[PDB]
């Protein structure tokens, strides 16, 4: 009896941290036509309905949203999808030509003076020996003067040739589910006050993650998930100011963005089967694009985030909000895509407040660009075709990306500024509750068994 | 109602249960192990790697004389050095994760002992078959 012997068990429920290649799944409804979408993937298998989520009682797991894999994989997959959706489209090599530009004083407002240029240029036709004189409207951010006459060129012409986005392909994000392959499991942290790292007392195993929409934006997380109980402040090292602070709201803040210009699209034949979609005359008045948020709602949300930040920086601390220090237009502005148009909004009014220890709306102007450098890459630029009519979109601000300034000693004041630029933080805000583990089905334990001779 | 037992019968449903109780749901994990351009290449590589891992595990089990069995009793006696813990403690209090953490140090020693025991048993079978 006291003589115990080794018994071998296969299929034991034990696992370890591991990295693998998850396979994406998309909702079946997405397969109803609408194949023209950047994120529409044929690889993504149909979503298994009535998903099953098994709760692992008494199991405590260690999570780390900052060293987490399955965020780098998501970044890579999104970038690859973006490139794949751009391969078949037109390369705008002929567009790198001298332009004779002039201002559009055609019922513009004082804030839109010089923002639009009326540029005329010679272009190749479908016949190699013929040329056409055409004109288009270009945003001042897309053309740079070259030096009487005033000649311009596209900003990208000394770096690379831009690929025109296919007009039928949509930029609207669609939910994507990441699923574990054979021999692997995805563990979900069900704790509602989880700060992204450390043990998670409440754990469950899921076949696939919740549908995560690949929303690309800076300084403001849009259309994401909301904290269930309180505003969550998450940082790899809160004391270290070099680390971005990810803020998750418990209630959304509605943001209304519009491009009030009635744009007109114009097709120009660049070559055999090649079309360049230019911008024709704007029908009506020319006015600045802008976004609106409720003043009271934003103030309440800022008060809440300040309340949660004081838990990390002391009660009697002055918390200040300031606009971006500087950098490229992508990071210093709230960048996002609104119905196929790319916005660059000046959020200086959203982050203008100092908080003491004790029906109006905020209109923040926005600028439009058509030459897009996504994923912080250089040499791969995309030209966004113009969109006819008036653009309008409504979104939820579900979080922030903040950066703290290095203060000398303890100056009883902390100033936070909006950040972003690295989309891995955007995915990280949705995958913080997930991890991938590898099953280890082989187990040896003492049992009072003995084999024959 | 379906009942909470179906959860116990789900994948990793017994991960938190006592190893004695988790020993009755081995087949779930065992079957999950075989569940079924660059994206296609990566998916194919993952599938091939999973197949290779499963085959390596099966080859190990066969090398221990445990081929085709999910629970296999052996001839290797249990060393008190590996764990002086009682039987009731192990099979009614701990879970497989805790037990794996405890005995992770001696796993290779146990594997080598199992291999040696199977080799000795095979040659003893062959020698008794040298006698019959």
């Amino acid at each position: 009896a006291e003589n115990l012997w080794v018994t071998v068990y296969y299929g034991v429920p034990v696992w370890k941290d591991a990295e693998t290649t998850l396979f994406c799944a998309s909702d079946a409804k997405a397969y109803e036509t609408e194949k023209h979408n950047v994120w529409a993937t044929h690889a993504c298998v149909p979503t298994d309905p009535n998903p099953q989520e098994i709760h692992l009682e008494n199991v405590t797991e260690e999570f780390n949203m900052w060293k987490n894999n399955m965020v780098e994989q998501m970044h890579t997959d999104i970038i690859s999808l973006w490139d794949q959706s751009l391969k078949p489209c037109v390369k705008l090599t002929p567009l790198c030509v001298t332009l004779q530009c002039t201002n559009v004083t055609n019922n513009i407002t004082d804030d839109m003076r010089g923002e639009l240029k009326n540029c005329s240029f010679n272009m190749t036709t479908e016949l190699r020996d013929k040329k056409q004189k055409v004109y288009s409207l270009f945003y001042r951010l897309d053309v740079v003067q070259i030096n009487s006459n005033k000649e311009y060129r596209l900003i990208n012409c000394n770096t690379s040739a831009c690929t025109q986005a296919c007009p039928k392909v949509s930029f609207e994000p669609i939910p994507i589910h990441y699923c574990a392959p054979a021999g692997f499991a995805i563990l979900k942290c069900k704790d509602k006050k989880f700060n992204g790292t450390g043990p998670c007392p409440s754990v469950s195993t899921v076949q696939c993650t919740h549908g995560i929409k690949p929303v690309v934006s800076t300084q403001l997380l849009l259309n994401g998930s909301l904290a269930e109980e309180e505003v969550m402040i998450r940082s790899e090292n809160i004391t270290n100011n070099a680390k971005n602070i990810l803020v998750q709201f418990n209630t959304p803040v509605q943001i209304n963005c519009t491009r009030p210009n009635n744009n007109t699209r114009k097709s120009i034949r660049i070559g055999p089967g090649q079309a360049f979609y230019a911008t024709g005359d704007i029908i009506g008045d020319i006015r600045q694009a802008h976004c609106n948020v409720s003043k009271a709602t934003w103030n309440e949300t800022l008060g809440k985030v300040v309340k949660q930040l004081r838990k990390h920086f002391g009660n009697n601390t002055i918390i200040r909000f300031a606009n971006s220090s500087g950098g490229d237009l992508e990071v210093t502005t709230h960048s996002f895509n609104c119905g196929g148009e790319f916005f660059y909004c000046n959020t200086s009014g959203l982050f203008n407040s100092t908080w003491i220890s004790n029906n109006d709306s905020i209109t923040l102007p926005c600028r439009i660009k058509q030459i897009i450098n996504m994923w912080q890459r250089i040499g791969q630029c995309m030209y966004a075709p113009p969109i006819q009519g008036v653009i309008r979109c409504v979104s939820n601000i579900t979080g922030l990306i903040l950066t703290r300034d290095g203060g000398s000693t303890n100056s009883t004041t902390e100033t936070f500024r909006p950040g972003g630029g690295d989309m891995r933080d955007n995915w990280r805000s949705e995958l913080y509750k997930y991890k991938v583990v590898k099953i280890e089905p082989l187990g040896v334990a003492p049992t009072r068994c003995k084999r024959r001779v | 109602a379906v009942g909470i037992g179906a959860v116990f019968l789900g994948f990793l449903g017994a991960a938190g249960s006592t190893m004695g109780a988790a020993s009755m749901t081995l087949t779930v994990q065992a079957r999950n192990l075989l569940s079924g351009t660059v994206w296609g290449i990566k998916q194919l590589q993952a599938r091939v790697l999973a197949v290779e891992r499963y085959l390596r595990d099966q080859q190990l089990l066969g090398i221990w004389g445990c081929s085709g069995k999910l629970i296999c009793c052996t001839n290797v006696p249990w060393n008190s050095s590996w764990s002086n813990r009682n039987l009731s403690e192990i099979w009614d209090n701990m879970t497989w994760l805790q037990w794996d953490k405890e005995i992770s140090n001696y796993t290779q020693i146990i594997y080598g002992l199992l291999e040696e025991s199977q080799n000795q048993q095979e040659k003893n079978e062959q020698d008794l078959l040298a006698l019959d």
Partner: antibody
């Protein structure tokens, strides 16, 4: 004669732990799994947990996870709840009920009115 | 997670009439096996809850033909015909597919004199 018997009334002080019981008789204990539901007029009927006597698997709900501790004895065919850190909100009637896989709560208990008072 | 909404809170009815109880689920209740485990339970004053219908369509055990339930997915309804004095009590709808299970808000049947 499948019946479930539980204690009638237990009066204890707040911050203490009470041990209830649910005697299973007249039917094979193993086959069915015993569930518990509280009967309160403010929060309504809620499910606490359910045990399978065979494997001892204990399933809980997040609304009463933690303090609720459920144990069973196969020999005596008994299922107990050990509820700790009792407050006024815990005073209600607890029904112990049996269930089968893909079955139904065919038979229930008589209830157990618990009062938390010093 | 599975919110079980039951309406109306009170359902007055005269003896011999028909009373209808509506109970709506927040999400789908159909399990992977294909069956929907939604049950209706009745609690009399001073008595423990009693099962009436299981599977939302099948009768528990020779319960009256008066007690008939129907519905699908989000919407489920229990109908009681020829109301009798013994039918007084609280009716509760309950789903048993997704853990944790939840009970209905409760409908108080009231007989009329």
């Amino acid at each position: 004669q499948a019946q479930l018997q539980q204690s009638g009334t237990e009066l204890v002080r707040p911050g203490a732990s009470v041990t209830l019981s649910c005697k299973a008789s007249g039917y094979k204990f193993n086959d069915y799994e015993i569930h518990w539901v509280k009967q309160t007029p403010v929060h309504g009927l809620e499910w606490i947990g359910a045990i399978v006597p065979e494997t001892g698997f204990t399933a809980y709900s997040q609304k009463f996870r933690g303090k609720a501790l459920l144990t069973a004895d196969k020999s005596s065919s008994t299922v107990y709840m050990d509820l700790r850190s009792l407050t006024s909100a815990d005073s209600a009637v607890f029904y112990c009920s049996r269930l089968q896989l893909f079955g139904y709560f065919d038979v229930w208990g008589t209830g157990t009115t618990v009062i938390v008072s010093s | 997670d599975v919110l079980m909404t039951q309406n109306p809170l009170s359902l007055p009815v005269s003896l011999g009439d028909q009373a209808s109880i509506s109970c709506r689920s927040s999400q789908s209740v159909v399990y992977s096996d294909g069956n929907a485990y939604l049950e209706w339970y009745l609690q009399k004053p001073g008595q423990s809850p009693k099962l009436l219908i299981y599977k939302a369509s099948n009768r528990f055990s020779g319960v009256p033909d008066r007690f008939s339930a129907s519905g699908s997915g989000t919407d489920f309804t229990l109908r009681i015909s020829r109301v009798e004095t013994e039918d007084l009590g609280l009716y509760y709808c309950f789903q048993g597919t997704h853990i944790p299970y939840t009970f209905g808000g409760g409908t108080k049947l009231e007989m009329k004199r």
